[PDB]
Design a protein around this ligand. Sequence first.
Ligand SMILES: *[C@H]([C@H](C[C@@H]1CCCO1)NC(=O)[C@H](CC(C)C)NC(=O)[C@H](Cc1ccc(F)cc1)NC(=O)OCc1ccccc1)[C@H]1CCOC1=O
Ligand SMILES: CC(C)C[C@H](NC(=O)[C@H](Cc1ccc(F)cc1)NC(=O)OCc1ccccc1)C(=O)N[C@@H](C[C@@H]1CCCO1)C[C@H]1CCOC1=O
Lengths: 305, 301
Amino acid sequence: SGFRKMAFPSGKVEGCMVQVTCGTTTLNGLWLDDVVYCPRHVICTSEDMLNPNYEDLLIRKSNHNFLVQAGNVQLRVIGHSMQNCVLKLKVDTANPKTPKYKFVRIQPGQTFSVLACYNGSPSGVYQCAMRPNFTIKGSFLNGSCGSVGFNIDYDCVSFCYMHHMELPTGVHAGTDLEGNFYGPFVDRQTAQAAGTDTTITVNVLAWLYAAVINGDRWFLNRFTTTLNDFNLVAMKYNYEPLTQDHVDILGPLSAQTGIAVLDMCASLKELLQNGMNGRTILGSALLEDEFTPFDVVRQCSGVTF
Amino acid sequence: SGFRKMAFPSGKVEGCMVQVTCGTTTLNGLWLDDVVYCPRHVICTSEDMLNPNYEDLLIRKSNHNFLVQAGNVQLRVIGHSMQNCVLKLKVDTANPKTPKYKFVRIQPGQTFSVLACYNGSPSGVYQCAMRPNFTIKGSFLNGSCGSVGFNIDYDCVSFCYMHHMELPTGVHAGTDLEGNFYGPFVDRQTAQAAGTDTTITVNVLAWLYAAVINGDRWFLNRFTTTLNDFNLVAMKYNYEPLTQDHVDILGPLSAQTGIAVLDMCASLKELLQNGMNGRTILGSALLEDEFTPFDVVRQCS
Ligand SMILES: *[C@H]([C@H](C[C@@H]1CCCO1)NC(=O)[C@H](CC(C)C)NC(=O)[C@H](Cc1ccc(F)cc1)NC(=O)OCc1ccccc1)[C@H]1CCOC1=O
Ligand SMILES: CC(C)C[C@H](NC(=O)[C@H](Cc1ccc(F)cc1)NC(=O)OCc1ccccc1)C(=O)N[C@@H](C[C@@H]1CCCO1)C[C@H]1CCOC1=O
C-alpha cells in the first residue's frame, strides 16, 4: 500500500539528451534517430530575445554555428530547419539509443513526467500536470530549456513537452515536440501572464478514491448530489466543471470502492464548503489534483513499463 | 525557479533490475557485476514465514533452484551465499550495464529515490526519506520486494535501501545492501510495529529556507529563540530535537538568505502555534520534512 507522486522510469529518455550550443547560448536537445530537437530561441543572443525575428536569425546561421555534444562526442550537424518554436538539427549519426517513441500533444489535466536537464545531462525527474491555464508548476533553473516531458505506454515513449520559459509567477510554459506552444504564450521576453488557474476536478475525485483504497474514508458521507448542483458549487471555487465523460472515466474506481461518483462529488462539495477541518487525506492538507484516474489505477495495480 | 519533490533519473538502476524466482516466490533482484542481490526471504515457503531458519533453508538449496531472468534471458547461477538478510547469487555473466556504484547506509532524515519494480520491471520512481522511526512512507504492492532506493552523485549510484516488508500502518521497512535492517525489524511475519513517527525538524527548516529563496517570506517574524527553548516547544509537536550539528549544516542556507538559523526556528515555532491560516508554502499546506539541506541547495542552485 501507500500512494506517492510517482514519475515514469526515465532511462529511455536519458539516452536521448544532448547539449546544444549556438554562440553563447547553451541548452539541452533531444536526439532521436538522426535529428536533434531543441527550442528555436537557442539562436538568440541576450539582446535578440526582446523582439526576435526568427526567420532572420536562422537565415543568418549555418550548420557549423551549432555545436552538438552527446556526452564527450561531438555530433556533426549536416542540416537545420525550423518547425514552429522548435529547431531541428540533422546530424550525421543516428542515436543508437533511440527508443520506440511518438510525439503527442496532451490536453489540460493530463499528467506526465519531466526530465530536468542541464548541459545535456539529466539531473532529476518529477511528475507534473498540464494545468487548465496551460502552464506547469515545475522546477527549472537557467539552462534547463530543452528539458522534455513524457509518458510511457507499453514500451513506447510519448514525448509531450519541451521547456521554453518561466512566467513571472514562477510557473513554466513550453511547447509540444512539434513546436506548438501550450497556452497563449510566445517565445519572446515581452510581458506575459497566465490566466487564472483552476482545479482539475476529475483528478481530485480520482485522488479521493485512492485515499479510500488506502483506508482514508473519513470524508465520505451518506449523501449524493447531481452533476448540475455540483458544478454550480465547483464554478464558485474555481473548479473545472465535471462532465459526464469525467464521471464515466471514474467508473472503475467507483466500482472498486463501492462509492458512486456523485457520492464522492458530495464529499468533495462538502470539502469545498467546509474544508478538511484539521484532517489530512493521504498525507496532504490540500485537495490534490495532479493524479489522473488512470494514474490511480496504474499505481494501485502495479503496472510496469 | 519552483520547487518539487524530485527523484534522481533512474536509468542507471533500471539496467540492473532482474527477476528472481525460488519455488513459488518471485521478486526483484539487483544485478551488479556478476552478483544478484535480493531479499533472503525469496527462499521461504508459505509455512516458513513465521520463524524461518534461513541458514537451514539455504543449505538445502542448489544453484539450479534459483531462476534469474534479465529481460528474456536466463542467467546461470553458479553460487549462492547469505549476508545478513540479503541473498547473493553469483552468476556466470557480469552485468554489462553495471554503473559505478557504492553501498551506503543512510541515517534518519536522509533522502533517496525509490525505483518501484515488479517481476524485474520498473513501474515508477519516487523520492523518499528515512523516517526517524526507521521506516519509509513508500508506495509498494505485492511483488515489490527487492526494489531499491538510491542516490546518484556524479555518475556513481549509492544504493542505500532494499525493500522487504510492510508494517500494519502501511509504512515500509527494509535493509541496506549489506542486508542489515534499518530499525529493529526482522524478516519474519511475527507481530511488529514502528515507533511513533516524528517530524524531521532540520529538513523542515531547510524547506522554509527554500521558500524564502523562492520569494516567499509571509511566515517570518521579528523574533529569535534559543536552541533549548525551540526544542522544548518543538518536541510538544512530535518534532525531532534540533542539535548544534543540524544548526551547523544550515549555515550555508542561513548565509545565502541572510536569515539566522535561530531566527528561522522562531518562525517555525509560530507556524506550529498558528497553522497556515489558509496559506501555502511552496505549494503545500503542511510543513514538508523530506528535503534535506543538501537537497535544497542542489535544487535551488
Ligand atoms: C532556458 C530558460 C528557462 C527558464 C529559466 C528559469 C526556468 O525557466 N528560458 C528563458 O530564459 C526564456 C528565454 C526567452 C523565451 C528567449 N525566457 C524566460 O524564461 C523569461 C523569464 C526568465 C528569464 C531568465 C531567467 F533566468 C529566468 C526567467 N520569460 C519572460 O520574459 O516572460 C515574459 C515576461 C517578461 C517580462 C515581464 C513579465 C513576463 C533557456 C533560456 C536561455 O538558455 C536556456 O536554457
Ligand atoms: C517474509 C515476509 C518478510 C515477507 C513480507 N511480509 C510482509 O510485508 C508482512 C505484511 C504483508 C503485507 C502484504 C502481503 F501481501 C503480505 C504480507 N509484514 C509483516 O508480517 O510485518 C510484521 C507484522 C506481523 C503481524 C502484525 C503486524 C506486523 C512481504 O509480504 N513482502 C512483500 C512486500 C510488501 C507487500 C506490499 C508492500 O510491502 C513482497 C514479497 C513477499 C513475497 O514476494 C515479494 O515480493
